[PDB]
Design the sequence.
RNA sequence: CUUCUUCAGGUUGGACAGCUGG
């Protein structure tokens, strides 16, 4: 890879409540050993065979360690892993036609990072995604989520795809003609957005000033769009901005 | 043989504003 940060991507996906589906997912009337075997074979053949075939469809830079049953462990270029996470979610949702959900954790590590710690950390992220519960009123976690590089960046799959990826696409399409001072301006935007929690007024003013400085190579309309996002959807905006910085980092790859 | 030693009127306007390269 030529553009991005020289980082390995570790993906760990797991179907939510597959054991519950095997216990009581099938209605009691349609319970037989043949139906149970059909469901088991569907799941197993999907994971093993179809993950192989789907990753062979386009030359993803992935190095699948294990697919097996209900689980997944793949290591590759972090951009390819991030791109294939949504493809995996969509293909699983098609295959099950939205009867089972999948949780994933995506870790980002350097090449010489310990493999034991890669596995442990990405498992922790996958557990955090399985801990996803948007409202503290329901019973049992929603579990249909993905964790992005850190246990604080747990987003649902719909949230991830729609919000984060449309924001990342807009940022990419509006930030490609920035200067090398613009990169530092994006860094400052990220720092200000992270600090907004402990600085309500001065920090939003500083963000407005930074957008003012930027709105000469990005346009006034997108500066206003970023300002609106910062006051409405901040954590998604921070996620998209960090992903853009890591994807466009010119420190080899 | 005379007094005025200066009085009156204008008192800034328009233009450019950061661009390239790593
Ligand atoms: Mg599971
Ligand atoms: Mg499992």
Sequence:
């Amino acid at each position: 890879v030529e553009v991005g940060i020289n980082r390995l991507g570790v993906l760990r996906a797991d179907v939510d409540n597959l054991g519950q589906a095997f216990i009581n997912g099938i209605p009691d009337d349609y319970l037989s050993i043949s139906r149970t075997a059909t469901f088991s074979r569907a799941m197993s053949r999907f994971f093993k065979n179809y993950l192989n075939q789907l990753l062979a469809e386009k030359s993803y830079k992935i190095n699948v360690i294990y697919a097996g049953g209900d689980d997944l462990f793949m290591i590759g270029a972090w951009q390819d892993i991030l791109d294939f996470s949504i493809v995996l979610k969509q293909k699983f949702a098609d295959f099950t036609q939205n009867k089972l959900s999948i949780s994933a954790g995506i870790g980002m590590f350097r090449e010489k990072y310990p493999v034991a710690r890669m596995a442990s950390l990405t498992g922790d992220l996958e557990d955090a995604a399985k801990d996803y519960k948007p409202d503290e009123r329901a019973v049992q976690a929603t579990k249909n989520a993905v964790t992005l590089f850190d246990a604080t960046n747990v987003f649902s799959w719909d949230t991830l795809e729609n919000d984060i990826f449309v924001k990342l696409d807009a940022i990419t399409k509006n930030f490609e003609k920035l200067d090398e001072t613009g990169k530092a301006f994006i860094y400052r935007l990220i720092d200000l957005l992270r600090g907004v929690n402990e600085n309500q007024q001065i920090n939003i003013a500083r963000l407005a000033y930074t957008l003012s400085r930027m709105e000469e190579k990005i346009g006034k309309t997108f500066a206003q769009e970023l300002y609106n996002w910062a006051n409405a959807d901040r954590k998604t905006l921070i996620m998209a901005l960090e992903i853009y910085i890591l994807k466009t980092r010119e420190r080899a790859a």
In short: DSSP finds nine helices and five strands in chain A.
